[PDB]
UniProtKB/TrEMBL annotation:
Entry-linked Pfam families: Terpene_syn_C_2
Assigned EC number: 4.2.3.-
Native organism taxonomy: Bacteria, Bacillati, Actinomycetota, Actinomycetes, Kitasatosporales
Gene3D superfamilies for this protein: Farnesyl Diphosphate Synthase
PANTHER family: BETA-PINACENE SYNTHASE-RELATED (PTHR35201:SF4), TERPENE SYNTHASE (PTHR35201)
Cofactor: Mg(2+)
UniProt record similarity statement: Belongs to the terpene synthase family.
Molecular function in Gene Ontology: metal ion binding; terpene synthase activity
The protein's name in its UniProt record: Terpene synthase
Domain of life: Bacteria
């Protein structure tokens, strides 16, 4: 059932790499080099995702060659997504998905690994893995490997619920959405492209883990809200509708309440951490700010989610201003980290 989106609140200005044209050209030439499409129509649709633009908005100050390198990860993701999930009327079975997805996780870890059967665009996954990771630091490569594996594991969970034709509880959705959306992998690629890397102390610190998780969650809730109109099983709208036994339209104000309470917590943790933040944590927080705006500015102009959904506009203030923890025990601990 169709919904009406509410305006979005974002206290950060739009930003874009001033060499986007060059970034886009490098990516299109790479798309053609590895033929990440079966026909001209698929080629046009892949280019129309504007994966280069969303990365360029997240990385306005990064070297365009490195923005292009990490954008290949998202173009590959879109090309492989548009193939693997369009593979028959019948839902993909987790038991069929898992043996393929661990092979893709392995190639992200070590592209020299090869298998007796490989899906199309696996050569492209090898190429982008080397392009992204070869110039990176050892620590950045370790982050790339762990966050890629976490995303592939996350995908397996979405496939499990699609196979069962079931909707997860809101608590279970709020735990797993950060994993299924690969925002840890996104953050790892921002580090590689922009040239930053958290200390072990910062990366492990519960305040920074809460910052990363709250940011990951609300960013992917924005993704769900932008993708709903086009989708019409694990969308925030469908999850809340089932949780509260209400209509998808009745779910909308609840979705924006959760969005603004999680965004609100992110801003409190950001305010706590920025004064004492070293150059690396400052760079990550800048990347997080630019990603928030990037998803909104690109999400409503990209063909990836569009028209299906008109931009509902900008909100003067958040839809919910409560500082109280969300009553979801998977993520409630975040609020313990506010100083």
């Amino acid at each position: 059932s169709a919904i009406e989106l509410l305006p979005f609140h974002c206290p950060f200005a739009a930003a874009v790499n001033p060499r986007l044209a060059e970034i886009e050209k490098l990516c299109v030439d790479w798309i053609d080099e590895f033929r990440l499409y079966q026909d001209d129509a698929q080629r046009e649709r892949l280019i129309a995702t504007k994966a280069a633009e969303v990365y360029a908005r997240a990385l306005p100050n990064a070297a365009p060659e490195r923005v292009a390198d990490v954008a290949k990860w998202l173009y590959w993701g879109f090309a492989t997504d548009d193939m693997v999930y369009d593979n028959g009327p019948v839902s993909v079975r987790a038991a069929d998905f898992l043996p393929l997805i661990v092979q893709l996780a392995r190639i992200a870890d070590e592209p020299r690994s090869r298998f007796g059967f490989e899906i199309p665009y696996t050569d492209a996954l090898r190429d982008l893995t080397v392009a992204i990771t070869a110039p990176a630091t050892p620590g950045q490569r370790i982050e790339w490997r762990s966050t890629a594996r976490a995303w592939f594991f996350g995908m397996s969970w979405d496939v499990a619920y699609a196979e069962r034709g079931e909707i997860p509880s809101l608590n279970d959705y709020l735990m797993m959405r950060m994993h299924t959306g690969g925002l840890a992998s996104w953050a790892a690629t921002l580090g590689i492209a922009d040239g930053f890397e958290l200390s072990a102390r910062d990366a492990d610190s519960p305040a920074v883990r809460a910052l990363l998780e709250s940011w990951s969650t609300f960013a992917l809730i924005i993704n769900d809200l932008m993708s709903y109109a086009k989708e019409i099983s694990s969308n925030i709208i469908t999850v809340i509708a089932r949780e509260l036994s209400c209509s998808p339209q009745e779910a909308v104000p609840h979705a924006y309440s959760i969005l603004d309470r999680i965004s609100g917590l992110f801003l409190r943790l950001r305010a706590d951490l920025l004064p004492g933040a070293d150059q690396n944590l400052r760079a990550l927080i800048a990347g997080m700010e630019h990603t928030w705006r990037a998803y909104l500015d690109w999400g409503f102009t990209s063909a990836r989610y569009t028209p299906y959904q008109v931009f509902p506009g900008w909100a003067e203030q958040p839809h919910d201003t409560s500082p109280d923890p969300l009553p979801y025990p998977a993520i409630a601990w975040w609020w313990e980290q506010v100083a």
